[PDB]
Amino acid sequence: ASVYAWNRKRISNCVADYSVLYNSASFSTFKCYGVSPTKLNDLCFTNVYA
Amino acid sequence: SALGKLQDVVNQNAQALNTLVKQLSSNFGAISSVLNDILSRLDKVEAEV
Numbered sequence A: 001a002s003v004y005a006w007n008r009k010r011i012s013n014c015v016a017d018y019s020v021l022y023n024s025a026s027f028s029t030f031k032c033y034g035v036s037p038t039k040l041n042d043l044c045f046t047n048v049y050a
Numbered sequence B: 001s002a003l004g005k006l007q008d009v010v011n012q013n014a015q016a017l018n019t020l021v022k023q024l025s026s027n028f029g030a031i032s033s034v035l036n037d038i039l040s041r042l043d044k045v046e047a048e049v
Helices: A019-023 A037-042 B004-024 B035-039
Strands: none
Touching: A019 A037
């Protein structure tokens, strides 16, 4: 979708494996601000929105 | 109120420890007050800060 009409998808009741997204070199910009990408695989999440 | 001089000493000795325990819960400018919460979300270079 467009930037002014961005869509937000609900992610709940599932296992999220972030190691595959981190090990993929196709992404040109992958920078976190609250946590580190290495500790994502060992931590739960209350609500996930993309 | 006969033993007020001792009651005040006991109350102060308890309130000092209470204030210390409460200040243990302060953030001091960090992202969280719990040590394990910071040690398990950020990398070493970012956790040491």
